[PDB]
Amino acid sequence: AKAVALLLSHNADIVLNKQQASFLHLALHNKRKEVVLTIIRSKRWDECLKIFSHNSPGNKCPITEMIEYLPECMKVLLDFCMLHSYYIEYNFKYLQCPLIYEPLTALNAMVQNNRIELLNHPVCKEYLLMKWLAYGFRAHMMNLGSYCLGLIPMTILVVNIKPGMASYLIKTCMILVFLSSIFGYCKEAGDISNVLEWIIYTTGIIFVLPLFVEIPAHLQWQCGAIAVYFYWMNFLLYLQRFENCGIFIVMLEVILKTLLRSTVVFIFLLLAFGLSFYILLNLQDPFSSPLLSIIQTFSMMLGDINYRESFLEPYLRNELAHPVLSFAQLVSFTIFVPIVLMNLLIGLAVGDIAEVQKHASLKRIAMQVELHTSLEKKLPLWFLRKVDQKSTIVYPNKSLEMEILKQKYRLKDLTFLLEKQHELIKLIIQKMEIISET
Amino acid sequence: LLAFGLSFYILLNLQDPFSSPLLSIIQTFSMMLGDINYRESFLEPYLRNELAHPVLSFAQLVSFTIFVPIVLMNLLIGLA
Amino acid sequence: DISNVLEWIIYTTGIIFVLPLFVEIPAHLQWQCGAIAVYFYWMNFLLYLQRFENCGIFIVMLEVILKTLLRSTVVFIFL
Amino acid sequence: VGDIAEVQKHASLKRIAMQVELHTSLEKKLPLWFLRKVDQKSTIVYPNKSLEMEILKQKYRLKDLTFLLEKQHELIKLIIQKMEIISET
Structure with a gap:
């Protein structure tokens, strides 16, 4: 130095x-x-x-x-770069981009190196807030508004006309839904969320189809139901996107993988316990047909059925023929299988949620800057050149890796010095006046 | 509640517990609250073939009783 | 491992179910065997379907599952 | 949850281990004709279709440093044992 x-x-x-x-x-x-x-x-x-x-x-x-x-x-x-006085001033001019360079080049650099101590640095936080309230909030509000322009009339019309059939309020609602769906199709044309909105937009297209050609009523109403339900689910997704942190979408992948495993494990266990109950409890009426057995055991896992009269009372009158087997099935299905399945599922969920609570905790800023650069790149230059700001004011009233790394460099310097000193001492012997003790 | 309310309304209009959208949202509120008879209300009408959307209704049932509450409790317990 | 004794259970019970091909067997025993055999058949097939996936974490935690079930089937009875 | 965390670490590092285990068992219990016929060497993939070893390194570097210093100290002792100490004798 x-x-x-x-x-x-x-x-x-x-x-x-x-x-x-x-x-x-x-x-x-x-x-x-x-x-x-x-x-x-x-x-x-x-x-x-x-x-x-x-x-x-x-x-x-x-x-x-x-x-x-x-x-x-x-x-x-x-x-x-931070300035005090409490007249806190943000100098900027060190985060600046010189117009392969991205708009938020310094931010991309700092989030792709997971240097969290710099992401949570106050100046970068204020920079993100400035970019947000400058253009990102406006653009996101525009997207949510174009979506609501289709959401509201769909709900209004579904509430309006009684389902089961194929006055100008209906026409206005239909034309609003069609224009909003086409606009959203154009937006998407220009992850799980992608296929989700493709589902919603396709179903909205099916619902608006009878504006052009005749469609059977039952298909139209099936499409209407799935469309409305997915509309509200997607709007909840967007309302979560309102918040800066996108942890929920991050864990939604874990959610869908767990649902995929469950929708087959549950069906298979339903089938298994179904034939088990069928051959075990044939003497009774709720197991006369295998279909009756699977549906009623579906009810048993669903959560509502009377155990007393159906199972335990017939035991006392000795009308049941397999006491040990039936009681074993009962205990195994009500307090052995659901307890273990919930334990396993909660363990998997807690492990993956901890993983997310670390990775997304260090990647919230990363996904924020990612959507900001994408929005800026897909936006013209007029708006950014007009809203871009450099100064901001905030008023009060309105841990071992780098240490071992430092030790490694210090030890490398020490061993270099010692090697040089040893060579030097060898230099000392190689020319010496050894005469008195020669 | 609102989402599953309109879903159940347009899905189960043939029955009396979904005659009005208000009735549908209140009764689905009951469904998430924890007390209702599933057998007579849903499964028994299937056998007499009085229901018109088997796959859709059963999908909604499974998704609301053993897909949505399980996942919501898992997420909430993880955050907590 | 637990899977070995499981498939031994299933195969023995299948043998009991196919036994009346050779010699007469009482009906009630035959149907008890049929019930246990079918239920374990589907459980084992779920085991195999999990084995389809490369990761065998489920079989790894199945030992924890069975130890918890062993503790519970006595604690629950005692309580 | 405790045992599932233990599994989520051990089986996470042992998934590959159990995979290779069943592969070697299958190969050993299978004849040589199939393996000698299907065995392949080349593959193509198209895009469209953290502290233990550092402390260990530090330990070896420090061992080397202390060996060097011991040799240097012996060398300096060699330096005193033959010196022309007369002016300040």
């Missing part, structure tokens, strides 16, 4: 090295700390960042390398 600082205090030109590696690039590549501290501290940083590197992507922008390699240095730099 002393060498670089002393050189910079004097005239010491900064130039390309024909490898597209500036002196700052070399300082950062070698993971050096005090030199980068003395270059942030000292002046001429505007000039040092000015030279940049734009030809060979082998050495990227200085800010991106700064993010990737030394996090604490950018922590100090952003601390210097």
Whole structure:
């Protein structure tokens, strides 16, 4: 640090090295700390960042390398970017993008290196809030409004006309639903959520189809039911998307995998216990047919049936023929199978939810910046060039990996020094005046 | 409640516990609350072939009694 | 492992069910065997369908499942 | 939940182990004709169709450092044992 600082205090030109590696690039590549501290501290940083590197992507922008390699240095730099007085001022101008470069290039760099201490840094948080309240909130509100433009008339019309058939209020509702569905189709044209909205939009298309050609009533009403139910589910999805954190969509994949496993395990256990109960309790009327048995055992797992009269009372009158077997099936199905299945399912859910509670906890900012860059890239330049802001004011009234890493570098320096010293001492013996004790 | 309410309304209009959308939302409120007779209300009409949407109604039933509450309790217990 | 004794259960019971091909067997025993055989048949087939997947975590936790069931089938009776 | 967490770690690292186990058992209990016929060597895939070893490294580096320092100390002892201490004798 002393060498670089002393050189910079004097005239010491900064130039390309024909490898597209500036002196700052070399300082950062070698993971050096005090030199980068003395270059942030000292002046001429505007000039040092000015030279940049734009030809060979082998050495990227200085800010991106700064993010990737030394996090604490950018922590100090952003601390210097924060201003106090409590007139808190955010200087910006160090997160800036120079117009393969993405709009939020520094943010993408910091979220693809999981440097959480910099994502939760106050300046980046305010930057995200500024971008949100500038354009992201407006765009998301526009999307939700275009969706509600189809949601509201669907509910109104389903409440209006009694199902079971194939005054201008109906026509207005139908035309609103058609235009909203077509607009959403266009939006999607321009993950599980994707197939979900494809389901909803296809079903809305089926519901609006009798505007063109005749469709049977029963199919129309089946489509209407599935469409309304999925409409409200999707709107709950969007209302969750209102919140910045998207943990719910993250765990929705776990939800759907658990549902896929359950919708087959439950059917198979229904079938198994169905024939078991059929051959076991044939003497009674609720098991006369195998179909009756599977439906009634479906009721048994569903949660409502009278155990006393159906099972236990016939035992006392000795009208039942398999006491041990029937009681074994009863205990195994009511307090052995559901308890174990709930234990297994809760264990799987808790493990995956803990995994999410860590990964999505460090990736909330990542998904936020992801949707922000996607929105900016798919949006024209007029809006961004008009709303873009640089200054903000906030009023009060309105842990071991890097330490072991540091130890490793210090020990490497120590062993280099000791090797040099040993070579030096060998130099000492190789020319000595050994005469008195020769 | 609202979603499953209209779903049950348009799905089970043939019966009396879904005559009005208000009746449907209140009775489905009862369904999530925890006390209602499933046998007579749903399964028995299937055998006499008085119901018109077997697959859809059974899908709604399974999704609301052993697919939605299980997943919601799992999610809530995980967060807690 | 538990799967071995499980399939031994199923195969023995299937043998009892096919026994009246050779010699006469009382009907009640035959139907008891049929019930246990069918129920274990479907349970074993669910086991195999899980074995379809590469990961065998379910069979791994099945030992925990059976130990919990062994504790419960006595604690519940005693209570 | 305790046992399921234990499984979610052990079986997570042992899924591949049980897979290879059943594969070797199947291969050993199968004749050689099928394997000698189906055995393949090449495959193509198309896109469209953390602290134990660091402390261990530190331990080896420190062992090397202390060996070097022991040798250097012996060397310096060699330096004293033959010296021309006359001016300050």
